[PDB]
Design a protein around this ligand. Structure first.
Ligand SMILES: [K+]
Ligand SMILES: [Mg+2]
Ligand SMILES: [Mg+2]
Ligand SMILES: [Zn+2]
Ligand SMILES: [Zn+2]
Ligand SMILES: [Zn+2]
Lengths: 51, 96, 48, 51, 234, 44, 48, 48, 125
RNA sequence: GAUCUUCGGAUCACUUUGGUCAAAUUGAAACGAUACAGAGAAGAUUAGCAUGGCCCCUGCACAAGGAUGACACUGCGACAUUGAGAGAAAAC
RNA sequence: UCUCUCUUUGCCGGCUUAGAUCAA
């Protein structure tokens, strides 16, 4: 093996192109406390009118 | 080329607004109407990657697997769903 | 302007980065008024 | 590596009828030098014994 | 340690001692379009030096030789291999999809699982040769005279043809058949028309070839196929 | 590559002996010092 | 830099842009909107 | 060249003069930066 | 010369990467199908286009093509001056492609496209 | 071949070939023109700064410009149905 | 238990000097 030496005058040899980010690792389990009951009264008490 | 037209518009729509799940559901439906497998699962898994906590998407995927008689796929999908969200009972009830 | 050297164009154009150093070294060694000519030790790219 | 290359060439061309020694080295050089034409004399430049 | 490139010994030369150079990031893979190092060596004296053409991510997903593009198990072109054997699904031919597939596939292949085992390859080869050997082994009357007489006039349940002596299968089979019946000029044929017309230097050779008569014949596209359907009712 | 990416401030500065190194603060009794300073400020 | 941009491309993706006294208001607006969305998402109870 | 600006003439005294009337597209594309122009002017002084 | 001046014969195989005519094969197979084939696909037939003088197009192209190599299939379009000679080997196919360009039978010789025929694809495969 | 050596020999030197690829239509880019429309904010004229990314261009630039550079800015069903009547059907 | 209709039915572009101006 002999590493061929590079020309000091060479510009960048080739273009760099973007690639969309790969998929992530699978998501972990959620592990929540059991959901609570809100009832229609509290569902309505957070109903906001239109602006 | 009509399939190409629809696929390009769906892909650019989901690229512009990546958080709009309605676009993913519509994409899965339209694509499911003719080419019943493979890329349907691909699109739905991509949507799951975007947000895996969206129960309607899970139910939609399961239901589209029941349509096409894929029972073993659907049961693997339930296993993944219940092992991801053990505290939502919609998935458990559909499974049982 | 010939295809015989079209392999050397990338390096030839890449030497533009070092051109100002060549300008400085050339102007630094200008012959003084009392001497008709000056011979200079030079360093050149094989590309020219 | 030179030995291996020489063996490969000898196998390909079947021309392997040589020995090795010290004065043998000079003797092998002698025939090849005899086949060579003379080197001209410097300061003769355009033909007729040009160097 | 980015040690060595996967190169087959057919194109590594028949010398047990070779010298080769490497320049990092000197080229883009011709599949990955990813930066890759070149390895240049001399196969044999009197030959232009060879060089690798693809990265190490490829020739791993393809089990191939970086220089001569031949698979390292069967020694036949990679394109023909993936077209015939159809071992594992290939990648696309368009740029962005192929580069994304190649990059993620290289990632999952470096994860530890081998994408190519040779057991299935040998099995597929034996199956392929098996399939090849197995591959080795009133309405008709009106479509009979609808134009058979017409074209003859213009420029010329069972039916029996006539033999006159008036003075799937490729065309080269015809060429190496008529060499004993004389020199050849040109053989114009068509599989759909099933008609092959041949020309010789002399009419005597053609006529003596015709005299060999006691599957053979002696003297849009659909227009030329009307008599070709006669092969079912010949 | 860029004007603001050039080398600058290559020597990182560390707290010296009297500037409150970890050793000096560990040896020091901060609770009593805090109490005296609070009392002194209250005095004003 | 000129030769690199000539032989490489923009490399525009993944670069930040400082706030330069003309984007101050339009960026302060983004930060305030994000903060209000956070507070909204918090004070709303589960399943509402 | 290599930019397509083959209608710009760089005469031997290092003056960059268009060989034809340029449209808005060409005028916007043929606009060089301070580095190229500074190098051109240093080259002009060297040639002088 | 440093290259063979004779015609390719049956057993003149070369490496997959290298073009059989001495050049090098890329992967994109171009867009106008112009210069050199792609190592990713294995095709032996090439588009030749040009003159459409009379009905004897089949015989004239057969005469002008068989002398370059061994032929497996010839299909000539009657309506327009298009022919698709299919060669047995890559060597003869590419030699003919580089020997019948801008010649008199100018010929617009290119590379063939994937067949849309469900029947032709089956027999090719 | 030069040097010794004693006419046995010893010294001295020892494996090239920077390859976007073989003499330019058919493997270094990017388009002219003609023909069609033909300049952001709910009347009309019009300042701009942003948000999003497989859109870039000029720039040494993390300044700034290119029409506020351009494109894009919407819209739906994890609705449980019962509340009831009527003709039918099979059912209080 | 079908069919039709109605009803109940919780439900699913930003900023600045309002940017600045305005008679057939
Ligand atoms: K404006
Ligand atoms: Mg701007
Ligand atoms: Mg903008
Ligand atoms: Zn090899
Ligand atoms: Zn690769
Ligand atoms: Zn020759």
């Amino acid at each position: 093996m002999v590493t061929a030496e590079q020309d000091p005058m060479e510009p960048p040899k080739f273009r760099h192109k973007k690639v969309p980010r790969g998929p992530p690792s699978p998501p972990p389990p959620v592990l929540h406390s059991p959901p609570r009951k809100v009832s229609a009264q509290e569902q309505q008490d957070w109903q906001i009118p239109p602006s | 080329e009509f399939q190409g037209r629809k696929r390009k518009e769906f892909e650019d729509a989901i690229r512009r607004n990546r958080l709009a799940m309605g676009h993913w559901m519509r994409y899965g439906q339209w694509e499911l109407d003719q080419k019943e497998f493979a890329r349907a699962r691909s699109v739905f898994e991509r949507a799951l990657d975007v947000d895996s906590t969206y129960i309607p998407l899970w139910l939609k995927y399961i239901e589209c697997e029941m349509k096409n008689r894929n029972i073993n796929h659907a049961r693997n999908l339930f296993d993944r769903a219940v092992t991801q969200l053990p505290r939502v009972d919609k998935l458990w009830y559909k499974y049982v | 302007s010939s295809r015989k050297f079209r392999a050397d164009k990338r390096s030839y154009l890449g030497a533009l980065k070092y051109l100002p150093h060549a300008v400085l070294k050339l102007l630094e060694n200008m012959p003084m008024p009392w001497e008709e000519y000056r011979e200079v030790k030079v360093l050149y790219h094989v590309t020219g | 590596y030179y030995a291996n290359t020489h063996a490969i060439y000898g196998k390909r061309n079947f021309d392997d009828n040589e020995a090795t020694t010290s004065t043998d080295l000079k003797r092998k050089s002698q025939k090849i030098k005899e086949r060579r034409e003379d080197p001209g004399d410097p300061s003769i430049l355009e033909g007729d014994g040009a160097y | 340690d980015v040690e060595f490139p996967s190169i087959c010994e057919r194109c590594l030369g028949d010398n047990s001692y070779v010298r080769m150079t490497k320049e990092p990031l000197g080229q883009e893979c011709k599949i990955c379009s990813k930066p890759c190092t070149i390895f240049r060596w001399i196969k044999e004296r009197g030959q232009k030096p060879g060089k690798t053409q693809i990265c190490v991510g490829c020739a791993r997903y393809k089990n191939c030789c970086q220089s001569c593009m031949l698979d390292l198990q069967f020694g036949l072109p990679i394109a023909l291999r993936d077209a015939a054997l159809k071992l594992v699904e290939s990648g696309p031919t368009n740029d962005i999809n192929r580069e994304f597939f190649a990059q993620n596939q290289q990632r999952l292949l470096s994860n530890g699982e081998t994408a190519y085992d040779s057991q299935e390859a040998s099995a597929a080869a034996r199956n392929l040769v098996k399939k090849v050997e197995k591959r080795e082994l009133v309405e008709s009357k009106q479509i009979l005279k609808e134009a058979r007489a017409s074209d003859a006039s213009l420029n010329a349940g069972n039916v029996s043809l006539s033999i006159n002596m008036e003075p799937e299968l490729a065309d080269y089979k015809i060429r190496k058949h008529f060499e004993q019946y004389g020199p050849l000029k040109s053989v114009v044929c068509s599989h759909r028309a099933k008609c092959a017309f041949v020309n010789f230097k002399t009419r005597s050779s053609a006529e003596i070839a015709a005299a060999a008569s006691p599957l053979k014949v002696q003297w849009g596209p659909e227009g030329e196929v009307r008599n070709a359907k006669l092969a079912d009712l010949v | 590559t860029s004007s603001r990416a050039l080398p600058a401030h290559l020597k990182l500065k560390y707290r010296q002996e009297s500037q409150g190194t970890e050793e000096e603060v560990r040896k020091q009794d901060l609770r009593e010092a805090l109490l005296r300073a609070e009392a002194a400020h209250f005095a004003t | 830099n000129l030769l690199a941009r000539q032989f490489e491309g923009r490399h525009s993706t993944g670069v930040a842009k400082q706030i330069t006294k003309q984007r101050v208001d339009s960026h302060q607006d983004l930060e305030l909107r994000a903060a209000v969305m956070n507070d909204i998402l918090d004070m709303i109870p589960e399943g509402i | 060249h290599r930019k397509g600006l083959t209608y710009l003439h760089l005469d031997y005294n290092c003056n960059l003069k268009p060989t034809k009337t340029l449209t808005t597209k060409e005028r916007k594309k043929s606009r060089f930066g301070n580095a190229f122009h500074l190098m051109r002017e240093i080259l002009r002084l060297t040639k002088l | 010369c440093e290259y063979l001046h004779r015609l390719p014969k049956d057993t003149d195989f070369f490496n997959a990467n290298v073009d059989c005519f001495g050049r090098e094969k890329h992967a994109d197979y171009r867009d106008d199908m112009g210069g050199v084939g792609s190592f990713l696909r294995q095709n032996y037939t090439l588009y030749v286009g040009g003159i459409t003088p009379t009905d004897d197009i089949e015989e004239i192209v057969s005469r002008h093509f068989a002398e370059w190599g061994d032929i497996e299939r010839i299909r000539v379009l009657n309506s327009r001056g298009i022919a698709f000679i299919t060669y047995l080997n890559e060597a003869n196919a590419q030699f003919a492609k580089e020997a019948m360009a801008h010649q008199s039978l100018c010929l617009n010789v290119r590379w063939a496209t994937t067949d849309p025929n469900p029947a032709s694809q089956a027999r090719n495969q």
